[PDB]
Amino acid sequence: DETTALVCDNGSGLVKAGFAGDDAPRAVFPSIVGRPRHQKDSYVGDEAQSKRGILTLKYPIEHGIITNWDDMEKIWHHTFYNELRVAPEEHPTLLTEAPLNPKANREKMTQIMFETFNVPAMYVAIQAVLSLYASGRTTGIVLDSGDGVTHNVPIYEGYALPHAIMRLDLAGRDLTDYLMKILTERGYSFVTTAEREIVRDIKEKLCYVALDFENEMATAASSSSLEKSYELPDGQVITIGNERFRCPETLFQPSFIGMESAGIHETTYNSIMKCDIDIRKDLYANNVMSGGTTMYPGIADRMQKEITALAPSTMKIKIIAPPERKYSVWIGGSILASLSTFQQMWITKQEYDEAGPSIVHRKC
Amino acid sequence: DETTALVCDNGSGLVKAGFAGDDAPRAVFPSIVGRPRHQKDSYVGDEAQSKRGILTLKYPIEHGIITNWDDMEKIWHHTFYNELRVAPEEHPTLLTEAPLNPKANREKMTQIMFETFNVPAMYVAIQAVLSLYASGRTTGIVLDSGDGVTHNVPIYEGYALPHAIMRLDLAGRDLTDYLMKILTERGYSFVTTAEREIVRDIKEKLCYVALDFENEMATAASSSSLEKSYELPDGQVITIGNERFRCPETLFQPSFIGMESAGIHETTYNSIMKCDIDIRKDLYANNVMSGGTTMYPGIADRMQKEITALAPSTMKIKIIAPPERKYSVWIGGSILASLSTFQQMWITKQEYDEAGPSI
Amino acid sequence: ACSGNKAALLDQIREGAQLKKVGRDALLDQIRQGIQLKKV
Ligand SMILES: Nc1ncnc2c1ncn2[C@@H]1O[C@H](COP(=O)(O)OP(=O)(O)OP(=O)(O)O)[C@@H](O)[C@H]1O
Ligand SMILES: Nc1ncnc2c1ncn2[C@@H]1O[C@H](COP(=O)(O)OP(=O)(O)OP(=O)(O)O)[C@@H](O)[C@H]1O
Ligand SMILES: [Ca+2]
Ligand SMILES: [Ca+2]
């Protein structure tokens, strides 16, 4: 793969990167950069936490938005030179951004890609949209939930609807936190050295969503139907019960981590209600879920149930949970970038040299 | 053994040298060089002290640091040509250095090895680390105590932690001195001609560490439980009692030779305290001891006791005293140099010719 | 795009399409492993 396009999706927690045309990211590494805590000069990814002990670790991406441009540069460098092993100047590069990304950010990003990395061509696409594309639709409402943030994004004919976007500062990073908390409140000594890592694995291995939380609690109270076990490496085995479904419940009841916000079913319903009454039909029947925090077993049907209850009785609801939705966004991009009707949509270095960083903002 | 790697650990008092892959140094000789006191041109090792009488003896290594580069050259020459009987230019050579070795020294050493000895490849490794390796660990705190100096070295994942290193200019060379002193203060005429030698043998044969110094003194005061005897060659037999454990006690109480420094238990504890709070657990449970001055019977348990008292009650402590710790460092190197994941870590003459000593 | 080009891109997307099917740490690990040493 040379003279081919690159796809780079920068999550709050995870970076996904690869080549357009590929069915999956060749590179998935933690979105973190570490510099020597005292006085080589920088580390990124797995190696940065491997040596967390002698570095100050930082996260360029907070809430899905880029906040540290220097550190973000180191991430992109590590992406091209160290992960993909490619030269940016001979690959058009597609990049992804959060809904509601400020214009100054988009331009700052376009500006770096050109001046600093000297890529021949580039494009910025909104993450949620790519997810939708990945499913083969151009109309619907996406629920993207990654490590740092959660959005509801209504989309109509390839264009998102900014007035109707719902943002929720609750994602997997805080769900892992919640689980770590509870687990400990039951005598399980957990810290960050290496525990934080285990707590996350338990999360993705054992947690699931209850179709009926009140009802599911009573089950785990009257039998051991729902107990499951996890042997730590130390050796100490531990058992989990209602904790398996109480942790993800936080997505529907944020008041579990004490957030007086509303749950993803409500924000999904509110988001649709915020749209043209004539396209609601299309939206209700096209809930596409993306992100790693949507991977919980049972979340699709819980959502289906919750929404059927909020909406009109006559409307047909539908939830689409691609088994690959952990990587939907990236896949969405992988597809786009490879299509031929898209090849005219690239921003060329030439175009940028004439107009300026502002040559990356279109309406319609 | 040809085209194989060489391992060379230069102590303040002793040089250890051999071949990588071997379980022990084929050559262990005094780290001293003697030149004609008045006017062949140089002697090294056992032969140099054999003829001390007509030479000026000198020690290139003081405090574990190389201070005389000319003399150090003669040592390395004697190592290759006269001990190992090898040619440097056909053997990668691994060398050892003290914690906190100045960069100019390391480079000066790399520079000699290449320009003067023309070895194909070389590596410099920190002595304490090798000891740790020898024990099969890559994380822990080493207590290296040889003839000239004592260090506490905290190490995490193969890398030492320089901010946390504790140096103590008290080792076996001064313990032998202390013992020589006392012994004499009891009517035993001891000088250097050949006595100094005996005093050292008595040290390594009879000295040990008390688990409870105050308590051990009272024992040797109320009975002869702890007396032991040593026949000199002259013939004159001599008896030792509390001197057997008072001599090593100097490691825990430097105020015995009038050093207002703190003991190895304290510096060990201080060294750990100087580290990241998250790796202290690993360190406390991995005290590896190396050097010939750690060979005293009872030192492992004294240390275990002393540290349990300084540290949190909840922390698990552990002392590892390899029976081979006299040679840990060298062994540590012997192992390293032979490993295959290491063969890319060598500094090649080529690499040196391009960049410079700073490579 | 804001032109008649956007409709074909859109249509193309819905259509579908496949996607091609896809030193210090080792030294460290080796050390811990252990080793035998020729006897002298
Ligand atoms: N099987 C699983 N079950 C539950 N959670 C999972 C699973 N797999 C991954 N996750 C969670 O998904 C999160 C990462 O997902 P993703 O890569 O979509 O987010 P991101 O793009 O890095 O961040 P964001 O999109 O919030 O900016 C992690 O917090 C991880 O715990
Ligand atoms: N069995 C023993 N009991 C006590 N001391 C011993 C014993 N064997 C050796 N020693 C002492 O160990 C010292 C030499 O140890 P070692 O070879 O580790 O030091 P070195 O590397 O030459 O010097 P340094 O490490 O201080 O620069 C000598 O002073 C010797 O008296
Ligand atoms: Ca994301
Ligand atoms: Ca030494």
Give the number of the ligand closest to the Cα of residue B127.
Answer: 4
Phi-psi region of A344 (alpha: psi -120 to 50; beta: other; left: phi over 0): alpha
Residue ranges of B 156-175 with Cβ closer than 8 A to chain A:
156-157, 163
Q: Choose the final residue of a domain: A211, A238, A257.
A: A257
Give the number of the ligand closest to the Cα of residue A199.
Answer: 1
> What letter does residue A80 receive in the DSSP assignment?
I
Residue nearest to atom 24 of ligand 1 (CA): A146
Which residues share a beta bridge with A320? A288
Which chains share 3+ C-beta pairs under 8 angstroms with B? A, C
Same domain, A162 and A200: no
Would you call B359 an interface residue with chain C, using a CB distance cutoff of 8 Å? no
Question: For residues B70-103, b (16+ Cβ closer than 10 Å) or e, as one string?
Answer: ebbbbbbbbbbeebbebebeebbbbbbbbbebee
Q: Are B45 and B29 in contact (CB under 8 A)?
A: yes
| CB atoms inside a 10 Å sphere around CB C4 | 7
Does the C-beta of A204 come closer than 6 Å to ligand 1? yes
Q: Give A17→chain B minimum CA distance, Å.
A: 30
Residue nearest to atom 12 of ligand 2 (CA): B292
How far is CA B142 from its chain centroid? 12
Same domain, A25 and A99: yes
CA of A143 to the centre of ligand 1 (A): 13
Dist. CA A292–CA A327, nearest whole Å: 8
Same domain, B51 and B158: no
Dist. CA B104–CA A66, nearest whole Å: 44
Does the C-beta of A295 come closer than 6 Å to ligand 1? yes
- Token pair of B270, please? 């201080």
Does the C-beta of A266 come closer than 6 Å to ligand 1? no
**C-alpha distances out from residue B134 to B101, B138, B142, B327, C23, Å:** 21, 10, 11, 9, 20
| CB atoms inside a 10 Å sphere around CB B118 | 12
By C-alpha distance, the chain C residue nearest B135 is: C32
Same domain, A198 and A49: no
Same domain, B153 and B291: yes
Count Cβ atoms within 10 A of the Cβ of residue C39 and give its class: 0-12 exposed, 13-18 middle, 19 or more buried. Answer: exposed
Phi, psi of A37 (to 5 degrees): -65, -30
| CB atoms inside a 10 Å sphere around CB A166 | 22
Which chains share 3+ C-beta pairs under 8 angstroms with C? A, B
Contact criterion met (CB < 8 Å) for A339 and C13: yes
Give the number of the ligand closest to the Cα of residue B328.
Answer: 2
For residue A50, the domain's CATH number is 2.30.36.70
By C-alpha distance, the chain B residue nearest C26 is: B341
Dist. CA A153–CA A142, nearest whole Å: 5
Dist. CA A311–CA B21, nearest whole Å: 76
Which residues approach ligand 2 with their CB closer than 6 A?
B 11-14, 64, 146-149, 171-173, 176, 200, 203-204, 291-293, 295-296, 326
- Token pair of A3, please? 């003279």
For residue A269, which amino acid is it? Answer: Y
Same domain, A50 and A76: no
Q: Are A44 and A21 in contact (CB under 8 A)?
A: no
Same domain, B164 and B311: yes
Residues of A in contact with B278 (CB under 8 A): 53, 193
**C-alpha distances out from residue A270 to A152, A166, A262, A319, B76, Å:** 9, 8, 10, 16, 81
Helix (H) or strand (E) holding A143: strand A139-145
Q: Are B19 and B5 in contact (CB under 8 A)?
A: yes
Would you call C1 an interface residue with chain A, using a CB distance cutoff of 8 Å? yes
Residues of A in contact with C22 (CB under 8 A): 18, 22-24, 26
Torsion of CA A256, A262, A265, A267, to 10 degrees: -150
Of A143, A99, A117, A174, nearest in space to A272 by CA: A143
How far is CA A192 from its chain centroid? 23
**C-alpha distances out from residue B240 to A77, A150, B210, Å:** 70, 79, 15
Q: Give C38→chain B minimum CA distance, Å.
A: 5
Total domains present in chain A: 4
**C-alpha distances out from residue A280 to A132, A268, A271, B4, Å:** 16, 12, 10, 77
Dist. CA A227–CA A238, nearest whole Å: 10
Same domain, B38 and B155: no
> What letter does residue C38 receive in the DSSP assignment?
B
Q: Decide the pairing of beta strands A93-97 and A6-10.
A: parallel
Dist. CA A236–CA A266, nearest whole Å: 40
Dist. CA A97–CA B37, nearest whole Å: 80
> What letter does residue A22 receive in the DSSP assignment?
B
Domain that holds residue B306: 126-171+261-322
Phi, psi of B251 (to 5 degrees): -70, -25
Residue ranges of B 139-168 with Cβ closer than 8 A to chain C:
157-158
Q: Which of ligand 1's atoms lies nearest the C-alpha of A15?
A: 22
CA of A291 to the centre of ligand 1 (A): 6
Question: For residues A216-246, b (16+ Cβ closer than 10 Å) or e, as one string?
Answer: bbebbeeeeebebeeeeeeeeeeebbbbbbb
Of A152, A154, A148, nearest in space to A169 by CA: A148
Torsion of CA B339, B343, B344, B345, to 10 degrees: 80
| SS3 label, residue B29 | strand
Q: Are B164 and B283 in contact (CB under 8 A)?
A: no
Q: Which of ligand 2's atoms lies nearest the C-alpha of B28?
A: 17
Phi, psi of B95 (to 5 degrees): -125, 160
Same domain, B90 and B17: yes
Q: Give C28→chain B minimum CA distance, Å.
A: 7
Dist. CA B189–CA B183, nearest whole Å: 8
Residue with tokens 């000199």: B232
Q: Give B358→chain C minimum CA distance, Å.
A: 21
Residue nearest to atom 21 of ligand 2 (CA): B11
Q: Are A18 and A334 in contact (CB under 8 A)?
A: yes
Does the C-beta of A30 come closer than 6 Å to ligand 1? no
Number of Cα atoms under 13 Å in the Cβ half of residue A39: 5
Same domain, B107 and B20: yes
- Token pair of B241, please? 């009692």
Task: Report resolution (Å) to 1 decimal.
Answer: 7.0
By C-alpha distance, the chain C residue nearest B331 is: C37
For residue A266, the domain's CATH number is 3.30.420.40
Q: Are A37 and A54 in contact (CB under 8 A)?
A: yes
Of B284, B278, B155, nearest in space to A193 by CA: B278
For residue A244, the domain's CATH number is 3.90.640.10
Residues of C in contact with A340 (CB under 8 A): 12
Same domain, A48 and A104: no
**C-alpha distances out from residue A111 to A105, A163, A229, A344, C4, Å:** 10, 27, 50, 20, 28
Same domain, A14 and A112: yes
